[PDB]
Amino acid sequence: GASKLRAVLEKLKLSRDDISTAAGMVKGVVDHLLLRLKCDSAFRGVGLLNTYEHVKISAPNEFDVMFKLEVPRIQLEEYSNTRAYYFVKFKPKENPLSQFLEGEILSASKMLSKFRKIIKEEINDIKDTDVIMKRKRGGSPAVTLLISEKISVDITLALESKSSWPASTQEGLRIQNWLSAKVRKQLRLKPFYLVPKHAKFQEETWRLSFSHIEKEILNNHGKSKTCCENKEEKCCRKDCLKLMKYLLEQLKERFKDKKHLDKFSSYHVKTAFFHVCTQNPQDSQWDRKDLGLCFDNCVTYFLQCLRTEKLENYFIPEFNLFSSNLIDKRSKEFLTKQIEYERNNEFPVFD
Ligand SMILES: Cn1ccc(-c2ccc(Cl)c(CNc3nc4[nH]c(Cc5ccccc5)cc(=O)n4n3)c2)n1
Ligand SMILES: [Zn+2]
Numbered sequence: 001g002a003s004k005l006r007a008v009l010e011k012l013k014l015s016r017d018d019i020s021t022a023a024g025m026v027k028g029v030v031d032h033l034l035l036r037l038k039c040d041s042a043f044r045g046v047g048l049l050n051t052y053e054h055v056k057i058s059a060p061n062e063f064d065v066m067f068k069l070e071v072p073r074i075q076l077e078e079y080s081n082t083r084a085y086y087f088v089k090f091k092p093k094e095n096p097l098s099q100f101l102e103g104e105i106l107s108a109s110k111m112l113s114k115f116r117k118i119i120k121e122e123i124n125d126i127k128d129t130d131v132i133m134k135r136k137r138g139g140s141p142a143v144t145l146l147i148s149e150k151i152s153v154d155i156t157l158a159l160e161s162k163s164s165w166p167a168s169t170q171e172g173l174r175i176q177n178w179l180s181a182k183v184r185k186q187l188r189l190k191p192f193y194l195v196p197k198h199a200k201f202q203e204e205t206w207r208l209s210f211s212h213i214e215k216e217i218l219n220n221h222g223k224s225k226t227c228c229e230n231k232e233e234k235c236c237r238k239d240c241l242k243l244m245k246y247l248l249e250q251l252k253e254r255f256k257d258k259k260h261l262d263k264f265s266s267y268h269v270k271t272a273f274f275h276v277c278t279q280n281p282q283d284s285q286w287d288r289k290d291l292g293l294c295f296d297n298c299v300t301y302f303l304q305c306l307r308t309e310k311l312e313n314y315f316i317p318e319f320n321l322f323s324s325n326l327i328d329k330r331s332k333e334f335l336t337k338q339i340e341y342e343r344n345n346e347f348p349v350f351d
Pocket of ligand 1: 083084207208209210211212213214267270271274313314315316319
């Protein structure tokens with residue numbers, strides 16, 4: 001019941017709070033890479049996007065960092081009505097990414113090749129730690145590093161644009177009735193990001209990225225400004241999200257051997273959870289004592305998304321993350337049956 005859910009959260013918390021040098025070993029290797037990257041004229045603006053960055057909770061030795069780089073005077077062209085994938089053009093100063101142009105369009109291929117080369121140069125330059133660099137599965141993540149053992153670090157490269165968000169976001173981020181119109185504008189004044197990624201041959205498109213929004217909302221998540229600052233206003237929003245990510249991660253681990261769940265990842269969970277926040281904007285709909293009901297309502301909504309094959313991207317509402325062409329009926333049905341079994345049995349995977 002809600003009692004088991006609380007126990008799971010307690011153990012997830014105790015794993016987080018424990019003394020770990022892995023952060024230190026990773027920060028040591030990352031600060032090395034950021035400096036050597038800064039010596040190359042093409043990557044002088046590079047910096048960490050966010051100064052606990054883990055894709056997984058069940059694998060804590062696995063880190064995820066993102067190197068932002070501003071590209072000002074930026075021009076974008078929507079690719080094939082995908083609403084999310086774009087060509088990156090420029091606008092008479094010397095563009096420091098000149099070596100990376102293939103026509104007017106900036107090449108992700110070229111730019112990642114110099115990215116990896118510099119990082120590959122610096123990994124063999126470190127004598128303190130034995131760091132192994134893996135090879136190009138995709139491009140996002142750009143580089144995977146194995147520090148000592150058990151420590152793996154996925155470094156993604158991302159352009160930054162400090163201009164208005166593209167017009168396909170106009171109806172997105174629908175937090176007005178929950179966090180307010182004022183906050184929605186504040187957020188839309190923040191930069192946006194682009195990371196390399198193909199749609200489905202190989203065009204040179206970039207996918208919009210909003211990696212920096214979630215932490216802004218998670219750490220100020222109530223309709224009330226004092227939500228979760230006193231005993232009278234403890235809510236369970238953050239606990240519901242943790243549980244949903246942990247449920248998905250434990251199922252992916254359980255069924256890692258077959259491919260059924262490989263198409264799902266925690267941003268599907270986050271998308272669905274924040275849609276539930278939009279549907280339920282009042283802090284009183286997330287009272288701590290209703291953890292069991294609130295979480296069950298998150299599960300149920302995510303399942304409805306699976307069965308109906310509709311999960312609208314939080315930022316670009318016309319982009320359906322669960323459409324037929326992205327995830328086949330069979331995978332969604334398999335995830336549906338796993339989660340429904342779990343719920344019918346008070347989640348044995350949480351143990
Ligand atoms: C990593 N991946 C793989 C595929 C995509 C992707 C596909 C299509 C579009 Cl249309 C986009 C659009 N861009 C985009 N959408 C999100 N959604 C969240 C999750 C979230 C929701 C609500 C509040 C906070 C966070 C995280 C994130 O970083 N993004 N980035 C992203 N991304
Ligand atoms: Zn709260």
